[PDB]
Design a binder for this molecule. Structure first.
Ligand SMILES: [Zn+2]
Ligand SMILES: [Zn+2]
Lengths: 372, 116, 46, 48, 360, 434
RNA sequence: AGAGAGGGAACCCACU
């Protein structure tokens, strides 16, 4: 975490820009010093001293600033804030020290470390279980209206945004769809930031794949098993009215968490949702349309296999389906929000001090309490 | 123009005729931006003290009086855009009012406040 | 009247005063340890 | 709120009116004793 | 006609918001991004938000873009209702004043000398100071000797004095303060402030009569009360209806031999019974004393409440006799006969006779 | 918590070797809170870029350059869940990836490859959070852990031959839960590699030792397989509660509720795993000559009869330390705490207790007997209305916890984070077993 | 011989 992930968080944060002559701030290289207390002079704070005086065994965190107003100026080793250090780490004082040296520091060699000293209290970050991300799962909501529901808690690595689960569900209604025409089961998708049950074919059309044959190629990889094609036939025949990518995207934008104004600004919102909300692990770029289509086709194909029973259903308690958030991922998840909040406060400070016509003071821009 | 807009919040005074709100520096340097030709307070501080108010309530940034219902209620539709006062406390002396009436300008009070 | 404290890491002793910041004279170590009491202690050997 | 102060299992009706703290009560560990009658409990001196 | 829309603003900075909006309108009135709004209103006493006059909400949103002081009303705007638009511009409205700012806020100041320059006036005040003793406060008399003793920023001219931030006092502060920094209308000091420098009171349940009109000599009990023209509803004797009487027509009449209290004057706080009701002199005897108290009829009310009117403690001992001999302990409690000893060895405090104890 | 369902709480099959099956809090958090097994290790995760470069180096076809006709006759390959492309020959690709993992050329040891054989898939996981455990590698029905490895492993600190060298030797490797679904795991080599009426004869990995499936607290149980599983769980709960020397530097630590023992002993009946938890260096408990006998009737219903003479000889006689911390607060002159000995005539609200135990600075010198409601810290806070008479600062003192007694062990005086004076008092009370 | 006590809320670990 403290060797790679913190730098990843700093670099993955966009360089904030302010529009008057424009200026942007960027953080590129981070520095992690040894734990040190102070008013007072910088001196190495031994962990037992931090425990007795109810101090916090935390190491200061510096970073370099580069602002371009363009007139660029760099600022090396600007104090961001203090982050706690668990004992026996690679950045603790007593790393690799011999047992004699530890006994000189009133620290026993028997202590395994792995705990933080916060206000003199020894804290242990309990590893938290979670469902494994970026993995397709097929479950059965036997009480709901869906026969088999697929999901993929997609979360791109080194991305400040959290996971966004997409569901690919099949309406059950084993017989009729409570109609005189709705015969088969229709596959429907629950996208992030969209409150309605969007059909699968609508999404595939919205990805730039107009032909039913091409969509069936991306969903069913064999055209010599008519049973699976027959099962997907009702879902394909739900949305033969919508044939254009424009109309498909318009239907995507209809009934969103942020509803659209008109045909304009709703096509862009639907494009934004399909670009940066569903399936971030397959890529977030302009050319990632076909890769996202392939993975969505895989999700639908696995759902069809589950509906056929050719592949068994997935267990929520199988430990190949789980991840263990240790101190690394947990502190990274914490540092993402708090680093973003520090950036927000810097932006507020810059907004205050550009409207006066003057130049901001960067040392006062970065407040260390919000990060420590 | 920007010449009408006051520069700061200190010593803001509203005109007794058109309720024009400007700083004392702008009244001293420009007079009235609407009816100085009828008042002639430019080049005289005592004229400003006699023709401007030290007590006003509410300000209106009248930008387009030709299509404003507020300008219809405040009777400032035929004037120029600027900063106006809703309620003005004060009154011109009888000599100025009589001189304005001799020029065909009856003095209507801008004191539209509900006094109890 | 002054209280004698043992200067933690220094292991030396020094006087202290009321409303006196807690500092050692050798290296300014912040942790002081109060000396053992002067009154008698008696322990039943049970 | 007042409704939250009354509605709970830690409120006034259950937590204070039904089951309330009482004086003249002691709580300590029990250990067996076969040398006293079934209607006798051996309480400590510091409790008595 | 355009409509008014509420836009939330920074508190205390609404007039500056209007000024900035006017400057922005003038600066972009010839460009390709015009402000299509009509006017901006920032009232004198409405604090927190301003008003934008426009035919559309989108015009308001596109006009306030770039203004940070209105960022809390940027996403959504609320329109002032049509019938309530006139309420926006509706405005309502040797003496004594009360200071606005400083530590002397809303304190009674006697206007000593009115300076004809219309900038400041001399005010007589009672100092709320600690005489440079606590700071490194209620009203009390200005003690010049104390401020000469304590020293600091002080200059003496007999009874005249200058101290602690150019505060001018004499014998009592006499310092100049601005007319706009004081309120010269609506102070009305009391009698205690006079020493420092009609009325109607009808209560429900009281008994009143009618002194004039066609409904004269009708005694009834008070139900409600109002300010000047009460339009009271008295419950008269042998009348099930409720009539109407103002304050000037009624009078606090009380039958002889009833609970009476005094509301104000020299006799306030005392209770008792009245004896004989004259034209206006009502004589009564108190619940405390039997002295004659003569009061006006208006200074009476009907209230039925009753009138107010050892040495061994903490000493290290040594058990020198008995089963516990040789134990060192500290005496917790001691009596004439026995004493409880906190044993230093065991986790137990036991009581022994004083004859068995020997101090160290 | 408080859910009436059981599936999230049960001991699933995939908890084998990764998490202890016995240790768990037996309250309302059964199965939810678990304890990690001994050799289990959580993969810290690495970047997938070298794996993608290696796959593009070989004949792997990316999704943006394929026809949708040759997909079903080949294996779909995933990296960290995202579908990276297709490969035609799954064998000799899994063999190549494993060959690189048995050598640590490109792929880290923590990274896992899983070839789904029934459905044509091959997924490579490089996530941070997966839970794996090392296993031996069985090439033929022969272990790769030869005698020379043991010879070089016994002579540690001389050859500098560590566990990582054996991982680099392609003898052991970390297998996670996904890969356990596609591995044939030998329990012990002395039974599952000799020819018999053959069971499978297709083993891929061998368990190092079955005792490593247990946790830290289930490893101190002698003969845990002879017990009943609820008894093992209850012992796992009790093992984190036994008195003993919890740390070597306990005399420096100002811990609250420090339970230490006079004469802790290592168990006569021990496991091999206690040598690695260092339970023989900081033990918790004493070897006792127990007799399982019905007697006078005081060991009736889960109770034990003890020997008074043995207890008088220091048997289980523990010592209980409790620390008390207190600092004064420099504030806006209205209330000002300060450490001093309060006086009855001077201080107000002074509770009736002995204040002569305190020193001149309002603290207790170490080595002084204190009991219930005895003052340990003399601190007084000023009263703002002392002038607004003759009665001044009120007592704000921390007493010794009532119904407790003992000797003050040691007192430390220092400054806090804010720079205010701050004192800790550790009080010592021995606890004879009663 | 000078005689009473207060905090309060929140969240973790166990105990039967
Ligand atoms: Zn004018
Ligand atoms: Zn020293």
């Amino acid at each position: 975490f403290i060797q790679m992930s913190v730098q990843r968080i700093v670099e993955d944060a966009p360089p904030i820009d302010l529009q008057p002559p424009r200026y942007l701030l960027k953080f590129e290289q981070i520095y992690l010093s040894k734990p040190t207390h102070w008013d007072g002079a910088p001196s190495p704070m031994m962990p037992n001293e931090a425990r007795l005086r109810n101090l916090t065994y935390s190491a200061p965190l510096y970073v370099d600033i580069t602002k371009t107003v363009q007139l660029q100026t760099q600022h090396q080793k600007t104090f961001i804030g203090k982050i706690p250090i668990m004992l026996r780490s690679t950045y603790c004082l007593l790393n690799g020290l011999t047992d004699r040296d530890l006994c000189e520091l009133n620290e026993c060699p028997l202590d395994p470390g792995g705990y933080f000293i916060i206000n003199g209290s020894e804290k242990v970050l309990i590893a938290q279980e979670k469902m494994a991300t970026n993995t397709v799962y097929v479950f059965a909501k036997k009480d709901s209206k869906y026969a088999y529901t697929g999901e993929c808690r997609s979360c791109l690595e080194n991305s400040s945004r959290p996971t966004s689960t997409i569901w690919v569900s099949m309406l059950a209604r084993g017989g009729q769809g409570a109609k005189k025409s709705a015969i088969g089961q229709r596959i429907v998708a629950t996208l992030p930031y969209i409150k309605q049950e969007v059909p699968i074919i609508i999404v595939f059309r919205a990805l730039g794949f107009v032909s039913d044959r091409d969509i069936l190629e991306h969903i069913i990889y064999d055209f010599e098993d008519p049973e699976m094609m027959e099962m997907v036939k009702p879902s394909l025949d739900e949305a033969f009215v919508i044939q254009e990518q424009n109309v498909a995207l318009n239907f995507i934008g209809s009934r969103g968490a942020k509803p659209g104004v008109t045909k304009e600004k709703r096509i862009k919102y639907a494009k934004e949702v399909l670009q940066k909300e569903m399936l971030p692990h397959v890529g977030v770029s302009d050319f990632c349309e076909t890769k996202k289509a392939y993975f969505l086709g895989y999700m639908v194909h696995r759902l069809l296999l589950a509906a056929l029973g050719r592949r068994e259903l997935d267990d929520r308690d199988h430990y190949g389906n789980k991840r263990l958030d240790l101190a690394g991922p947990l502190l990274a998840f914490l540092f993402r929000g708090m680093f973003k909040n520090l950036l927000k406060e810097v932006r507020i400070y810059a907004q205050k001090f550009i409207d006066r016509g003057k130049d901001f003071n960067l040392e006062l821009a970065i407040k260390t309490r919000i990060i420590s | 123009a920007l010449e009408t807009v006051p520069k700061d919040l200190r010593h803001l005074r509203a005109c007794l005729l058109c309720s024009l709100v400007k700083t004392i520096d702008q009244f001293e340097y420009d007079g009235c931006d609407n009816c100085d030709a009828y008042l002639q307070m430019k080049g005289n501080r005592e004229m400003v003290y006699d023709c401007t108010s030290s007590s006003f309530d509410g300000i209106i940034a009248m930008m387009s009086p030709e299509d404003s219902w507020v300008s219809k209620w405040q009777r400032v539709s035929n004037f120029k855009p600027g900063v106006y006062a809703v309620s003005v406390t004060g009154r011109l002396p009888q000599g100025i009012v009589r001189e304005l009436k001799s020029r065909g300008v009856a003095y209507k009070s801008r004191d539209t406040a509900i006094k109890t | 009247q002054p209280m004698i404290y043992i200067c933690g890491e220094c292991h030396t002793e020094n006087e202290i005063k009321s409303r006196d910041p807690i500092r050692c004279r050798e290296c300014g170590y912040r942790i002081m340890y109060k000396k053992r009491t002067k009154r008698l202690v008696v322990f039943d050997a049970r | 709120s007042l409704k939250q102060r009354l509605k709970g299992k830690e409120g006034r009706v259950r937590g204070n009116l039904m089951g309330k703290r009482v004086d003249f009560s002691a709580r300590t560990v029990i250990t067996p004793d076969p040398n006293l009658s079934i209607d006798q409990v051996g309480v400590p001196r510091s409790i008595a | 006609d355009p409509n008014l829309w509420t836009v939330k603003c920074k508190i205390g900075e609404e007039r500056a918001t209007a000024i900035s909006l006017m400057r922005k309108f003038i600066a972009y009135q010839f460009t390709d991004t015009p402000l299509q709004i009509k006017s901006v209103v920032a009232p004198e006493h409405v604090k927190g938000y301003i008003y934008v006059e426009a035919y559309k909400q989108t015009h308001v949103k596109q006009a306030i873009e770039g203004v940070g002081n209105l960022r809390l009303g940027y996403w959504n705007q609320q329109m002032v209702p049509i019938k309530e638009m006139t309420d926006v511009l509706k405005v309502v409205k040797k003496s004594w004043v009360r200071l606005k700012r400083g530590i002397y806020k809303d304190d009674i100041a006697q206007v000593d000398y009115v300076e004809p320059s219309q900038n400041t006036i001399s005010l007589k005040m009672i100092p709320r100071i600690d005489y440079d003793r606590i700071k490194a406060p209620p009203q009390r008399l200005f003690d010049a000797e104390k401020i000469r003793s304590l020293g600091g920023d002080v200059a003496s001219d007999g009874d005249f004095l200058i101290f602690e931030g150019n505060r001018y006092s004499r014998k009592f502060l006499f310092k100049s303060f601005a007319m706009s920094a004081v309120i010269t209308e609506g102070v009305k000091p009391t009698l205690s402030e006079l020493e420092k420098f009609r009325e109607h009171n009808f209560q429900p349940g009281d008994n009143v009569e009618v002194c004039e009109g066609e409904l004269i000599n009708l005694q009834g009990k008070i139900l409600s009360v109002d300010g000047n023209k009460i339009t009271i509803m008295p419950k008269h004797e042998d009348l099930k209806d409720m009539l109407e009487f103002p304050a000037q027509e009624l009078r606090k009449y009380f039958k002889m031999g009833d609970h009476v209290k005094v509301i104000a004057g020299r006799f306030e706080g005392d209770t008792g019974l009245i004896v004989r009701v004259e034209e206006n002199f009502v004589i009564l005897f108190s619940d405390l004393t039997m002295h004659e108290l003569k009061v006006l009829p208006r200074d009476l009310q009907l209230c039925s409440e009753t009138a107010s009117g050892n040495e061994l403690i903490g000493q290290t001992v040594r058990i020198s006799q008995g089963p516990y001999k040789g134990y060192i302990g500290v005496v917790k409690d001691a009596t004439e006969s026995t004493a409880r000893v906190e044993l230093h060895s065991t986790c137990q405090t036991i009581s022994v006779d004083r004859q068995r104890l020997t101090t160290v | 918590r408080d859910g009436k369902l059981a599936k999230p709480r049960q001991l699933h099959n995939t908890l084998w070797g990764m998490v202890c099956p016995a240790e768990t809090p037996e309250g309302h958090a059964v199965g939810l809170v678990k304890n990690l097994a001994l050799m289990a290790y959580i993969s810290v995760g690495s970047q997938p870029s070298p794996i993608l470069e290696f796959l593009e180096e070989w004949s792997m076809e990316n999704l943006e350059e394929i026809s949708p006709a040759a997909i079903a006759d080949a294996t779909k390959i995933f990296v960290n869940g995202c579908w990276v492309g297709i490969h035609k020959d799954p064998e000799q690709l899994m063999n190549t990836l494993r060959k690189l993992r048995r050598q640590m050329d490109i792929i880290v040891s923590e990274v896992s490859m899983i070839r789904d054989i029934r459905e044509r898939e091959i997924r490579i996981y490089t996530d941070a959070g997966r839970i794996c455990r090392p296993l031996l590698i069985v090439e033929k029905q022969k272990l790769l852990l030869k005698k020379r490895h043991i010879d070089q492993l016994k002579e540690r600190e001389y050859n500098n031959y560590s566990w990582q060298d054996l991982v680099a030797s392609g003898v052991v490797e970390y297998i996670d839960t996904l890969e356990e679904e596609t591995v044939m795991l030998a329990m012990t080599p002395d039974d599952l590699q000799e020819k018999e009426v053959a069971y499978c004869s297709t083993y891929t990995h061998c368990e190092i030792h079955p005792s490593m499936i247990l946790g830290v607290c289930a490893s101190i149980i002698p003969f845990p397989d002879h017990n009943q599983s609820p008894r093992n769980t209850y012992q796992s709960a009790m093992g984190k509660q036994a008195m003993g020397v919890y740390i070597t530097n306990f005399h420096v630590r100002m811990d609250t509720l420090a339970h230490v023992l006079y004469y802790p002993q290592k168990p006569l009946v021990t496991t091999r795993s206690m040598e690695y938890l260092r339970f023989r260096e900081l033990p918790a408990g004493i070897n006792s000559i127990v007799a399982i006998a019905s007697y006078t009737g005081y060991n009736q219903e889960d109770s034990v009869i003890m020997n008074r003479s043995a207890v008088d000889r220091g048997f289980f006689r523990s010592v209980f330390y409790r620390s008390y911390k207190e600092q004064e607060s420099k504030k806006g002159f209205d209330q000002e705490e300060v450490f001093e000995k309060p006086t009855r005539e001077t201080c107000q609200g002074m509770r009736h207790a002995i204040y002569d135990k305190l020193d001149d600075d309002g603290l207790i010198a170490p080595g002084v007997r204190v009991s219930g409601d005895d003052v340990i810290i003399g601190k007084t806070v000023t009263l703002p209305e002392n002038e607004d008479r003759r009665y001044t600062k009120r007592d704000c003192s921390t007493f010794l916890r009532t119904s407790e007694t003992g000797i003050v062990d040691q007192v430390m005086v220092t400054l806090n984070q804010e720079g205010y004076k701050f004192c800790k008092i550790r009080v010592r009370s021995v606890r004879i077993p009663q």
